[PDB]
Every structure is written in structure tokens, then in C-alpha cells.
Tab-separated table of C-alpha atoms in Angstrom:
chain	number	residue	atom	x	y	z
Q	1	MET	CA	75.638	134.746	36.418
Q	2	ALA	CA	72.764	134.472	33.942
Q	3	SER	CA	73.981	133.572	30.444
Q	4	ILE	CA	71.928	135.532	27.855
Q	5	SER	CA	72.489	137.061	24.489
Q	6	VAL	CA	70.726	139.290	22.039
Q	7	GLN	CA	69.768	138.241	18.374
Q	8	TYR	CA	68.971	141.353	16.403
Q	9	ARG	CA	68.647	142.783	12.833
Q	10	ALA	CA	67.411	146.385	11.779
Q	11	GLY	CA	64.313	146.503	9.925
Q	12	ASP	CA	64.842	146.552	6.323
Q	13	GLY	CA	65.250	149.772	4.712
Q	14	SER	CA	65.233	151.631	8.137
Q	15	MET	CA	68.966	152.961	8.232
Q	16	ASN	CA	68.148	156.413	6.794
Q	17	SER	CA	64.642	156.359	7.339
Q	18	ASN	CA	62.487	158.381	9.980
Q	19	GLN	CA	62.497	155.073	12.229
Q	20	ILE	CA	64.644	152.979	13.864
Q	21	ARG	CA	63.285	149.479	13.694
Q	22	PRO	CA	65.198	147.342	16.021
Q	23	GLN	CA	64.140	143.710	15.789
Q	24	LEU	CA	65.563	141.689	18.706
Q	25	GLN	CA	65.377	138.239	20.527
Q	26	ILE	CA	66.700	137.319	24.023
Q	27	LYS	CA	68.018	133.766	24.373
Q	28	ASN	CA	69.135	131.912	27.391
Q	29	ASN	CA	72.163	130.241	26.663
Q	30	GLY	CA	72.825	128.971	30.272
Q	31	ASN	CA	71.734	126.220	32.455
Q	32	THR	CA	69.769	128.054	34.845
Q	33	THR	CA	66.373	130.058	34.308
Q	34	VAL	CA	66.126	133.669	33.510
Q	35	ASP	CA	63.422	135.857	34.970
Q	36	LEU	CA	62.882	138.452	32.525
Q	37	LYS	CA	61.379	140.903	34.903
Q	38	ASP	CA	65.138	141.249	36.154
Q	39	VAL	CA	66.512	141.702	32.702
Q	40	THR	CA	67.049	144.823	30.678
Q	41	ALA	CA	68.363	145.722	27.421
Q	42	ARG	CA	69.874	148.720	26.182
Q	43	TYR	CA	69.807	149.964	22.470
Q	44	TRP	CA	72.594	152.658	22.195
Q	45	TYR	CA	72.213	155.119	19.388
Q	46	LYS	CA	72.728	158.940	18.728
Q	47	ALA	CA	69.300	160.740	18.998
Q	48	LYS	CA	71.199	163.889	18.455
Q	49	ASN	CA	69.103	165.880	20.990
Q	50	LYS	CA	65.971	165.032	18.982
Q	51	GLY	CA	62.988	163.968	21.317
Q	52	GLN	CA	62.252	160.244	20.998
Q	53	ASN	CA	59.325	158.033	20.708
Q	54	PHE	CA	58.668	154.384	21.128
Q	55	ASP	CA	56.407	151.829	19.594
Q	56	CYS	CA	56.216	148.125	20.226
Q	57	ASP	CA	54.579	146.563	17.143
Q	58	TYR	CA	54.656	142.949	17.960
Q	59	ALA	CA	56.315	140.884	20.611
Q	60	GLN	CA	55.993	136.985	20.883
Q	61	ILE	CA	55.900	137.629	24.509
Q	62	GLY	CA	53.181	140.416	24.217
Q	63	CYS	CA	54.044	144.163	23.817
Q	64	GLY	CA	52.040	145.008	26.960
Q	65	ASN	CA	54.781	142.839	28.621
Q	66	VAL	CA	57.592	145.157	27.280
Q	67	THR	CA	58.479	148.258	29.047
Q	68	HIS	CA	60.835	151.044	27.745
Q	69	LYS	CA	62.416	154.222	28.605
Q	70	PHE	CA	65.130	156.500	26.956
Q	71	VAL	CA	67.797	157.666	28.795
Q	72	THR	CA	70.212	160.372	27.619
Q	73	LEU	CA	73.812	159.903	28.345
Q	74	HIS	CA	75.738	162.121	30.736
Q	75	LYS	CA	77.585	163.216	27.483
Q	76	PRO	CA	77.916	161.706	24.025
Q	77	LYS	CA	80.021	158.730	23.540
Q	78	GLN	CA	81.322	157.255	20.372
Q	79	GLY	CA	78.089	155.971	18.530
Q	80	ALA	CA	75.722	156.979	21.045
Q	81	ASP	CA	74.372	159.998	23.040
Q	82	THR	CA	71.194	157.919	24.226
Q	83	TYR	CA	69.909	154.292	25.065
Q	84	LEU	CA	66.618	152.892	24.685
Q	85	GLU	CA	66.152	150.526	27.563
Q	86	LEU	CA	63.771	147.750	27.217
Q	87	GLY	CA	62.356	145.695	30.388
Q	88	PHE	CA	59.858	143.233	31.019
Q	89	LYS	CA	56.884	142.763	33.283
Q	90	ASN	CA	56.940	139.245	33.702
Q	91	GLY	CA	58.296	135.735	31.802
Q	92	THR	CA	60.922	133.321	32.347
Q	93	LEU	CA	63.218	131.688	29.943
Q	94	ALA	CA	64.208	128.053	30.626
Q	95	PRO	CA	67.673	126.976	29.589
Q	96	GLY	CA	67.814	127.224	25.880
Q	97	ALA	CA	64.585	129.307	25.361
Q	98	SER	CA	64.041	132.588	23.646
Q	99	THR	CA	61.738	135.561	23.956
Q	100	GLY	CA	61.005	135.177	20.230
Q	101	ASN	CA	60.857	138.485	18.274
Q	102	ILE	CA	60.520	141.904	19.616
Q	103	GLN	CA	59.683	144.202	16.837
Q	104	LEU	CA	60.057	147.930	17.827
Q	105	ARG	CA	60.007	151.298	16.203
Q	106	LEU	CA	61.418	154.694	17.519
Q	107	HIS	CA	60.997	158.039	15.732
Q	108	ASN	CA	62.026	161.585	16.398
Q	109	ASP	CA	59.447	164.030	17.583
Q	110	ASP	CA	59.453	165.688	14.139
Q	111	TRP	CA	59.321	162.434	12.190
Q	112	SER	CA	62.628	163.679	10.556
Q	113	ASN	CA	64.891	160.950	9.174
Q	114	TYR	CA	67.545	159.423	10.928
Q	115	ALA	CA	71.020	158.565	9.893
Q	116	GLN	CA	71.669	155.236	11.734
Q	117	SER	CA	74.829	154.143	10.215
Q	118	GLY	CA	77.029	155.557	13.082
Q	119	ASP	CA	74.639	154.332	15.832
Q	120	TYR	CA	76.501	151.951	18.201
Q	121	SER	CA	73.596	149.395	18.302
Q	122	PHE	CA	72.646	149.553	14.614
Q	123	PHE	CA	73.662	147.459	11.755
Q	124	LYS	CA	72.077	146.202	8.658
Q	125	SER	CA	71.945	142.486	8.259
Q	126	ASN	CA	70.384	139.639	6.052
Q	127	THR	CA	69.177	137.652	9.036
Q	128	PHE	CA	69.152	137.893	12.983
Q	129	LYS	CA	72.626	137.983	14.320
Q	130	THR	CA	74.022	137.749	17.583
Q	131	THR	CA	75.211	141.300	18.727
Q	132	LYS	CA	77.353	142.280	21.555
Q	133	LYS	CA	76.442	145.960	20.843
Q	134	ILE	CA	72.987	145.679	22.259
Q	135	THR	CA	73.973	145.214	26.143
Q	136	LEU	CA	71.786	142.929	28.864
Q	137	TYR	CA	71.630	143.537	32.408
Q	138	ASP	CA	70.324	141.457	35.303
Q	139	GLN	CA	69.076	143.750	37.907
Q	140	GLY	CA	71.182	146.356	36.256
Q	141	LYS	CA	74.404	144.749	36.181
Q	142	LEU	CA	75.844	144.093	32.675
Q	143	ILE	CA	75.996	140.352	31.618
Q	144	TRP	CA	76.029	140.688	27.861
Q	145	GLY	CA	77.720	142.823	25.523
Q	146	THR	CA	80.064	145.684	25.642
Q	147	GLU	CA	78.778	149.210	26.362
Q	148	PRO	CA	79.993	152.160	24.141
Q	149	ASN	CA	82.990	154.210	25.521
């Protein structure tokens, strides 16, 4: 399988703000290329039955090349009742290459504050960290990380 992983950190100050601010990178750790069009990422969290809204503020690969959708889970899980799924229109990663930064913001329809501490894919961190809690897929097959249970 493709060997890719996600580096992430929450945007500073975002935790109890009115925005979820995932900062992500996807790196190809393997010895094969990766076609990003086949790759999706899922950021799992509790939207708590509030309508969700997406912005891409900047991506090294170009925000216009990033796709998104929100998916409500059948029923809530620990740490998640929704995921944001990211996809890509194009782009490849050679072995060792990274997407570079993908800087996103999510907000509730009513711009109310989130309380993100319990969100499966959320954590505060001083720097980008590898995380197993943002999952990656190759044509929909899980290839990085662990989904909430």
C-alpha cells in the first residue's frame, strides 16, 4: 500500500474559539509515488448537530486543488459525530515528498464557539506533529491512522 502520514497542529488559540483550525501536511514515507487524487483525509470531531462550514485559507498545493465535504456519522462515536473529508483534484508525491501546509478553518453556521478538547482529531501542540487521529485513505481504503470507535 501507499505509505503516507499526516502532520498536524491546531491553529493557535483555536480550541475554544469559533473556528476549528486544522493545519495539515501529508507526507509520502514510502518508496512509491502517491497520486493525491486518490487520497482522502478525515478530520473527526463533534459538530454536535450544528451545521458546518469550510474554508481553505492557504495550501502549498493550492486551495483550488483541495476538495472537502462534511459527513455526519451514522451515530456518535467517542470524540466524533462528524468528519471533514479532504480530497485533492490532482498532484503527486514522490517518495519523501510532502504536500506542505494545508491551512483550514471550520465554523458553525451560527459562528458559536466550539469546545474542541474532546474532538477525536483535535490537539493543541507547539509544532506540527504526526498524528494517527487524522486518517488517510487510498480510494477509500484506510491506510493511515485509526478511526474513532
